[PDB]
Amino acid sequence: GITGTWYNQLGSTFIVTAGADGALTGTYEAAVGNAESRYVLTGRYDSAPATDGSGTALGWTVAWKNNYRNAHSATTWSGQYVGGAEARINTQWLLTSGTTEANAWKSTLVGHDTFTKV
Amino acid sequence: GITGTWYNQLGSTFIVTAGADGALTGTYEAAVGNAESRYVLTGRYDSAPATDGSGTALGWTVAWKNNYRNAHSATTWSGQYVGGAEARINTQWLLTSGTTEANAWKSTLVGHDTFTKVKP
Amino acid sequence: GITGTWYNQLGSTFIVTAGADGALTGTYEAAVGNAESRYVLTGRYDSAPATDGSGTALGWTVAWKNNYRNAHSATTWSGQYVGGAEARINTQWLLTSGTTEANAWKSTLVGHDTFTKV
């Protein structure tokens, strides 16, 4: 359900596997920002959701270091999986950059991504 | 280092290991909310931070299901580690509950947690 | 440009006037939550924006008290106006409810609204 390949509105690629233990594992390729190639992602999802037409709560993290570049930053996406034939993961995110203490007030960006399954 | 046992301003306990190449693995025990006992967490951190005085970017996720309870929700914390005599993890977090599509506008709480290794 | 009537994806109605001094004034009618009828809004916008294809920064607040109900809560929308023939105000928001100190960790909801001019 969650497992598979997804793209968001920015053109980024999310490849994820949902494990029976509630683990999310995969890779993220961002189409924008201080990024190239694939980054490891790890996260968690509700592996026994409500069956009431509620989405499945999940989240994951990328630290923007790979063996090609390092942006000294990390994003977390928090959201829910909405199943069916046109599956979606609807998220909000927090992108924190490492900063000096004096600059910490401007460390974190916030946004929202919608992911479509392919 | 990041590895260790941390406490936030609500009294919740964050036990984590920082793997050499960027993993965060541990458990989270919340002192408030629809939760008891420990929950699995996973995340990532910058395993080669800048050497200019900046903190270490990191984040992690908890889905609030364990053998005791299931709140049908997940929190992600996004922040940075600040080393020093009084090491600190400063975060902002997003707590998404599963909801119907309709109620999705009120699905996500936002807040901020600071962590230190000082037991309450 | 900004002045006029707007609706968002939830079906809420935003009626605003942009003053020459950078003031935003108007009324908000929410289609969801603990709300009925029109609420006062006040806000600010950049009254001398960049002319570079950058949007116009703005924000506004509603306290969810009117002479019909009171939700003991307030939303702020922060975002930018994107002009032209299909004008949009793209926003993120923070909805804080009054809470006891022990409950303050769960005081604030976050989301995002897109407004279309009519």
Add this chain to the structure above:
Amino acid sequence: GITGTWYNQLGSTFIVTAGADGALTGTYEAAVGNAESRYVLTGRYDSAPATDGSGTALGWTVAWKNNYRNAHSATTWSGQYVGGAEARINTQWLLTSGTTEANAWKSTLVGHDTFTKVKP
């Protein structure tokens, strides 16, 4: 009350008047960022809060244009006032810069400011 002169943890000065029926009117002087001197602010607050111990919901906006500078940005603070011997305004804020549509994903900073009437 909410009316008065407030300072946050960055040292920025928030001078506000709470109108009887819900207005917030004042000035904001930021101690960090692309700003100097005072900026106009406006907002709203709950003029009949609950009587159970809860805080007073409020919010306000600053667009960062004044006679000295224009950062082409706006911040909104959303929070609540907590009365008591050490009154406090606890907020979360969103700072949106104008950007092209393309760069809109990195247009908005989020943070948290606490305010008290204690001068730094």
